[PDB]
Amino acid sequence: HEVVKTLVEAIILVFLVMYLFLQNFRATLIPTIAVPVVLLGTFAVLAAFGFSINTLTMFGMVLAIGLLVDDAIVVVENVERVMAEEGLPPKEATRKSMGQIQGALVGIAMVLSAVFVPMAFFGGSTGAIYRQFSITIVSAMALSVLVALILTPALCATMLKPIAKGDHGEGKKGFFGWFNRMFEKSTHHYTDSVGGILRSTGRYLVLYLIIVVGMAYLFVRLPSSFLPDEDQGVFMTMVQ
Amino acid sequence: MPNFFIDRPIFAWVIAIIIMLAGGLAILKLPVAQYPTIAPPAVTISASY
């Protein structure tokens, strides 16, 4: 039940971050509706395959939220950028948008299954544990693509606000106007920096190797265990 | 589909290669025998007087 609470809480927090960026109740709602739709469907798939609701399937759900919300965001954000880059209306924009990412969403789900499936194949007792996650996360991702191909486009096209060519929320007054201005600015600052780094380089491959060796260092030092001991509110005392 | 892959030979190879290693991995784990189970099963009751 505590994991369930975190799920709900996580969806609330997602709603808040969406708002910070989308700044419109109806828009933020899209990525927000998508999560529970996919999660609920995932339980149905778990039933279909004879899995139970357990600690591992539940954490699979939690971890899945990162993947799910990104699917919705990629879809919703890309449309936005389009309505900003062109002033094309909502229905026409999601079409052109979906036209240009939809291929990628599907391909990505494929490469991702390549990272989560292999773990369904661990051997022994170990294996049954990792398998709970693998199947939960893969199923959720598959459903997420489905939802991104069916629900999200429909939702963008009917619930999104027309953005006018060139508008970026700077016209707004109060926090958003301020936020939107800082980001637009900080963005030019981002590109300015990359533009610099791309004239350099060599040095950054060297920094990259630092990070790799460091990573390797920490890895071999981090002790390995299996599953944590939890305080389950009971215990026994043996007398011999 | 052929027209699709005629222009995407790498995509074509990828599919072939994935199939091959799925099969290579299968070979490492497949049981070996002369025959699968072909005799019908039997149950025996034994008693003594």
Partner: protein, 179 residues
């Protein structure tokens, strides 16, 4: 037990290979996939740092959370080089220009997702009470991984890309051409 141990190397080995093959199909290239796969370490480092820091262990929860972090940063990198590549291919944009326009179109979506998810797992790293051992273990790995993945990727992926596009090209630019 004997029985035997460590299947990890072999299975993530094939995982890497399949990921490479999938990406090669996606990009119709044997070289470009490296520009995505090189992001993998960038999330791991933060995960290891945060776990080393809280005194955690390399356990089930650490591993799955890492795959998730890796998945996401992979996805981010894929959509970045997809955009650059298309720009260079559909439009005639030259290498650097396309990389910069790609990277700039992708900043926001990347940030929206990173923040939504790092906050989303906060309740987990902060957890006390029933099952907080599991909750803490899940959350902190992800949080650290996502932080480093996010900050490190938005600078490094553009690097991976141009460095890979050069090394594995064939005298035909890197202007700028069209169409």
């Amino acid at each position: 037990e004997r029985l035997s141990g460590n299947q990890a190397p072999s299975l993530y080995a094939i995982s890497l290979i399949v990921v490479f093959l999938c990406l090669a199909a996606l990009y119709e290239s044997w070289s470009i996939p490296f520009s995505v796969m090189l992001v993998v370490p960038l999330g791991v480092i933060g995960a290891l740092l945060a776990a080393t820091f809280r005194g955690l262990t390399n356990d089930v929860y650490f591993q799955v959370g890492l795959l998730t972090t890796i998945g996401l940063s992979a996805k981010n990198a894929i959509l970045i080089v997809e955009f650059a590549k298309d720009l260079m291919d559909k439009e005639g944009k030259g290498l650097i220009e396309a990389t910069l326009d790609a990277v700039r179109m992708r900043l926001r979506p990347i940030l929206m997702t990173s923040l939504a998810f790092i906050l989303g797992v906060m309740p987990l790293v902060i957890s006390t009470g029933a099952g907080s051992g599991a909750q803490n273990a899940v959350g902190t790995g992800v949080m650290g991984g996502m932080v480093t993945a996010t900050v490190l990727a938005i600078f490094f992926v553009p690097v991976f890309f141009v460095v890979v596009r050069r090394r594995f090209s064939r005298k035909n630019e890197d202007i700028e051409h069209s169409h």
